[model samples]
Target: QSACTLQSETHPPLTWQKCSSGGTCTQQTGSVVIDANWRWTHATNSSTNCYDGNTWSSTLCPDNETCAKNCCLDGAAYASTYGVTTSGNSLSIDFVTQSAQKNVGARLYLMASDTTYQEFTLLGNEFSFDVDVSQLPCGLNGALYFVSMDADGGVSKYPTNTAGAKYGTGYCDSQCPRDLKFINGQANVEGWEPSSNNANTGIGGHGSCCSEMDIWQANSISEALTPHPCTTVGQEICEGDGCGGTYSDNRYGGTCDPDGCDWNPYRLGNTSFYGPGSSFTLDTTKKLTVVTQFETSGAINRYYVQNGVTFQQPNAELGSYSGNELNDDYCTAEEAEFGGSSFSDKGGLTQFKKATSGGMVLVMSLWDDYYANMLWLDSTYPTNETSSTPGAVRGSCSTSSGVPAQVESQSPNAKVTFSNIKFGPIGSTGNPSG
Candidate 1:
């Protein structure tokens, strides 16, 4: 009989079985691997898979402690910071701001760091959180968003060995390079979630939600980056902007396949939709809970729970399905000529395997929508207003600074804190209900 040892200081007590060189410990289906030196490699292929049964340990414990302990806003530790009692079973994110900082927008992203990545399998789809943006300075904008993208092939953005694990953060100004698979000269197809707010168009006089669903092809010729043009609804649209003239077919010439690369499965309608301001309100006294669900396949659903009410339907969907055709062609051509290799032969649908099957991480942020001219209160603010606008100084926001710098200059009273994060199966039935 081999003696199994479980070691831990902060993480859950992990039960490790003794293995000689390359021997089985207990024939467990999801057993972890331990070398002769007893080092934790996180290899999940063995007779005894401790992580499989241990949901909390696997989801909470990653390679990065700092990122996990500080960056992730969940659990009782997070609750303690916000002066509230919490349950490990519930995940809550709280954001609060002061007066002086009202002049500028501030943002903080509680993202899953690359050094210590969160396992998507353990996340089990169905996720939820309570949102209380009602008191977000009326005109100030605040939101809890999620992003899933792929890193350029030949480049190392995060420490993940997985291909589609890397994505943009709330801080990411532009869309990160995504994995594109091509076959028959067309990219694969997937779903999209475009339920967001338009920075130019205010949502219920609250905030501006924006969506980026189109794919931008890398500049290979003049080095001038240009978004791919795809035929949408009734005309050719490029980057949501119709062709120079209202005519059929892209000026650049391309087939129309509206659903070509529409893999984001969280949109309310077939076409991109806007956030319903009536669905939610920012309450200063109450903490709002937001819940999300990711299907085993590639479907994402979101919900809003507050007080004792639950909005069953997705309050806000995120993804673009309108211009999937252009995305497909752009990805295919770029991967073939620039990516050095094609990722999928099955078409655009099979582009990001990790993305479809849980390769992305959770990211929470609270920031003022600069492009919307901070219209949370000033509903009449002009669209696409820049710092150059008369009397409109973007302040520290218009500058290219990192989170650290922003935090240092942030108002002492302005704060966004998340707490009470709970994770479970997709249809666990523990989610809030009406």
Candidate 2:
């Protein structure tokens, strides 16, 4: 997973660094078209370092009689090279016959030797891929990504699921689980699908989309790290960034509360909200609250409300709501609900109306247990082309713990042109420049 050899001769040769500054070099090379189709998976486990500056090395298994007749006895065969009619990986139900059954259901994308491509994510492969596909009629916008088939036959990044296990090829809303299902925490399978369903299904679901509504709406601090924040106690809201800030009269243990930390912005307006659920549940000894706010329909903004209540104390018994906090000057917790999802057009709500637009909604909420998932691998693609299944990026826009990576596209001719691509952080800078 840790290998670097860069020898084009001494330390030069990748010189796109013509020199001038401000970044953006552009000197002169041998080829120039967009690099074929722009791919960039990084994590690094060694598929030779996962290429992308364009093949550092990762292709072996074309001999041995096609590798003793299509490999896979100890795992890791992955060939077909992605398309053209895959003739050296796995295939032998009896050798189907003609059209190979349309390749029966061709799908394969595991390229983890390092990766310029290949991922498993969805919270590290617990499992997530739905696709009722309404039973598949056709038309998913000319087709591109989405191909799963795991259980071992190998092949999944987006297909091999039909929500209710009908057959395979598409579906997600049946409550997720068409291929990968580790233990319900990939946060309802990120950016999920359903509703007339189409091939990679338009694209929706994943900001930790409902695992009990993201642990009853837990808010940031990295989502309290998820450890059973609470379920239904007596008094709640240990406020940190939810009910008026400055720690808003913090107090937990009673109504079993602790939802302090808000960050949901993951760029919904364009790219950076990160809320909904990554994990939650805090316990600073409870009892605290502070409030503040300022707004602007288009400019000035400031907010810091923190909130808390949490009374219902019960680890297994009867006492109810009494973790203590009888008087922070007494009676002062009026605005409880109506804090989260300010507009929620898609969890970003226009970047929380642009960071509370002018400011004053530092609201918070938490109990812990926020998840949003999506796991995929791939079925095919080398020249036959196809992409956009689980979207995100090759690791497959995940969560249950966070993996997310998939997005790759191009094929027009190539010279160099990859944008906003992702999937690094598994072994140092293998491919992280978005």
Candidate 3:
């Protein structure tokens, strides 16, 4: 019964570009693949499901190893099944896609080839992309980030993984999410905790953890740039609760920094910086270009352009510090004032070097948090904390606004489109001065 039915997996083409200081931009050929967590996993040699909605097949997956051999993922149907589409240079993802199976949001990775992920080394370089977040609202996150993951999606390292990066197999972040359908090429069946709220996911016995440099995590109302450095290098594996993060009892007990050093304009008292009106510096109602530079000096900076006008990130003032940039000292001071796991304790900026020099994958996703309701991004967090506190109130969104069920029902058609991805030296891409 373990012999599998393998289908031909094909990728949808996408086009991005690499730019030079003098405006010499060359187009890059690439594609996007949906994560395995959002795919069709069925029992070996049969069309029967190995994972149905939120539950695993008891007969096929009595254990992790058995499940790994007993089940296989089917090729994707692209837009028809996942509501994902790519034009000449843009990729668009729908919030709720309906097929034979109902799919919620999707997470995808940039593929250099059908067999491997496209790795981006950002140090001493800039990455820019045009994003339309008009349809994204509170409780939803349309994210574009860099993660320390194997370009091959661990297929070369784990003998059991035959799907590899072509199937979007490797995914890791500071969150140490245990909901990945496969971990280390094995099914996460043992000790899996089925989520009570969502019928499409569950926490597993283990999770993939790594450094996550969040260049963008936002919606129409707000945005943030955070860097979560972790003690681990590549896609390091960890056992349950002991690893900490969203699924754990103690969110800070793990190796990765769960609450990253963040720079959200509204959280720093510039509530008028980014929003939906002409009064806002960078209005979100329309498509805007975002530029982020990762200098060789270890500082990460961001800039924006909306309606042909350039807008600078407001000088992020928190406690006694002020800057629109992210560096070691900035992160250190942020921790002392706000208080959380010491980024220094988790290997700090030192960890970021490994991700870029060693290799990092680009990830784009549209999702809602079942744990925190994404309150941390677009609204007040630690709902118990008063607005008087420095880091409590983040945006105009209410603490209760991001409830997933309500968001799904109210903004089911919500979607985010990312386009014209450009990467190169700091003065390239979106920097017109170059």
Candidate 4:
């Protein structure tokens, strides 16, 4: 329901405690500080049992005796909870003790959860989470802690940091599943593949994964995030470059002829060529394989078509790409293979270049998502076409006697023009070469 957040560059500390009995300690908004130093650990990455000691880790929460399971309203606890409730996202736990001794100190904490993983030191008493929403694919909920202690090692499991038998064991619960749900109770999660090139990825500047609301066929940054897919497939839309719309269904628009000004032309990618078909029996799962052609002839800083894009191998030493001296360009040659992902160099624009006259250059393979696939242009990213009912299969291999003449073909270079125009030179240079 509702959650709490700490505001300020600097503030005092807060702490909390869990009763030994069944009374739950619900931490709300506030801050506190404590003195007792301790360390603790967990059984596994997904375990809730906190082996309290003089140290703490993300794998497990801390026991009240050593690490003290307590959390300050704003102080750091051994671990945060992923509590979820329709009424409101709050935390509840309890800690009680019967033994009375000297300096029998106890404390509870509810420090802010570290979504950025920059909250505390890796060693000593610390707390942590994946910090990436897409990587985890789990829901983002609140955190909870359970602090309990014992004066002397009386109960075998009393001074013990083992998980007790309860509903939400350990700090909040032993098994804390993600809050978000997708179709069939599954969650749409994503992973990242690091690259040696520069390719701006998603909203986050980092190459890491994050939550995104991508549009199927958006033509701009704002449009890409729009919640709509293009209506028509294989149809040309006037990409608003300075050039006019004389280019037809193409990615790069035609010349700035007197007949029309400079209008960036919108062309088709793999999405317009193949993908999920409504009437064609949809297979949500489709593997995409990219074929390249640009060899030594293709221009620099240009791209060739693949499942996605590739980068212009920067002229850097070993793992480095470019140099700040001289012309500030890399003379590195293109490798036969490079992975698909985002770029880190801010000014770098690494991607696949539409190869010129050559045999074929193998690009990166991806899922042929006929429904949604975007291509980056001068400004931001422009989306591809929307999906449609399975009308007709148009390709080189689809040559069926029962199929219509227009839908039959048996070659790899079958150029079925929708406008019936012969393939020829469009600009000053016969083929697509800038």
Query: What TM-scores do the predictions have?
Result: 0.35, 0.18, 0.96, 0.16
**Candidate ordering by TM-score (highest first):** 3, 1, 2, 4
Q: Backbone clash tally for model 2? A: 125
lDDT of 3 by residue, 67-109 (tens): 9998887778888778889998899989887888677778899
Indicate the worst ten consecutive residues by lDDT in candidate 2.
361-370
Every candidate's lDDT: 0.26, 0.17, 0.84, 0.17
Strongest candidate by lDDT = 3
* Tens-digit per-residue lDDT, 122-208, candidate 4: 111111111100110001111111111111101223323222111011111001111111101111111111212212111101110
The number of clashing residue pairs in model 4 is 74
lDDT of 1 by residue, 1-434 (tens): 01122322111111111122122222101111111111112223222321221121333233223212212111111222221222332222233322322122222222233213232332234444444433333223343333232222111442222211121121111121111111111111121111133211111101101111221110000001111112221111122112111111222212222222222111112211112244223223456555555444333345546666765432322232223222344445434432322122222323232333433333333343323333312222233555344212212122332232243244223334344444456544343321
The alpha-carbon root-mean-square deviation between model 4 and the true structure, to one decimal in Å, is 26.9
Where does candidate 3 clash, by residue pair?
none
lDDT of 2 by residue, 40-150 (tens): 222223333222221222232222122112211111111121111211221111101122111111222222122122222211111111111111110010111211112
Steric clashes per prediction: 61, 125, 0, 74
The C-alpha stretches of model 4 lying farther than 4 A from their native spots are 1-272, 276-288, 292-345, 350-434
Model 1 / residue 105 / CA error / Å:
7.0
Q: Score candidate 4 by TM-score against the native.
A: 0.16
What's the CA error at residue 192 for candidate 2, in Å? 19
Candidate 1 error regions (>4 Å): 1-115, 119-124, 148-285, 314-356, 374-417, 429-434
